[PDB]
Amino acid sequence: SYDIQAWKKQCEELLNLIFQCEDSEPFRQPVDLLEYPDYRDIIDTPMDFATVRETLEAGNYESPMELCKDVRLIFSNSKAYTPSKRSRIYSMSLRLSAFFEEHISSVLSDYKSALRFHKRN
Numbered sequence: 001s002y003d004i005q006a007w008k009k010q011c012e013e014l015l016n017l018i019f020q021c022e023d024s025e026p027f028r029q030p031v032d033l034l035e036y037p038d039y040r041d042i043i044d045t046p047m048d049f050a051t052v053r054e055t056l057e058a059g060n061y062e063s064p065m066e067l068c069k070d071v072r073l074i075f076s077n078s079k080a081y082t083p084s085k086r087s088r089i090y091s092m093s094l095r096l097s098a099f100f101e102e103h104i105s106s107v108l109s110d111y112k113s114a115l116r117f118h119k120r121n
């Protein structure tokens with residue numbers, strides 16, 4: 001399967017599944033600064049799933065590795081902001097991360113294989 005472009009629709013599909021997951025609800029839009037006025041004293045680069053989907057749809061990802069970096073930032077921000085490893089929002093982030101990683105692995109492998117095939121000669 002050597003289609004260099006196939007990752008984009010595969011990532012759209014996976015974002016749709018993430019938006020159906022109840023565990024994504026805290027991460028679908030930017031963290032609420034009124035509720036969390038100290039957020040930007042901890043978190044240098046906010047990220048959320050609506051921003052990832054918009055970046056993808058705008059044609060502003062060149063590879064699925066770039067999308068994966070932004071999704072992993074959603075999860076590292078949650079871990080950095082949590083007051084406890086037992087907190088609800090952080091606990092939802094860990095389940096959603098496991099789901100994401102289980103599904104993105106084939107997207108990344110297929111893309112990287114397609115690029116190697118493109119450069120074979």
Ligand SMILES: O=C(CCNC(=O)N1CCCN(C(=O)c2cccc(Cl)c2)CC1)N1CCc2sccc2C1
Nearest residue numbers: 026027031032036078081082083084086087088089
């Ligand atoms: O629930 C908490 C945690 C304390 N409260 C907090 O510091 N936060 C709660 C609000 C969410 N939050 C965000 O800013 C955030 C981060 C990512 C995404 C989004 Cl959407 C929002 C983090 C800040 N516990 C105290 C009471 C008890 S008693 C037994 C266990 C506990 C644990």
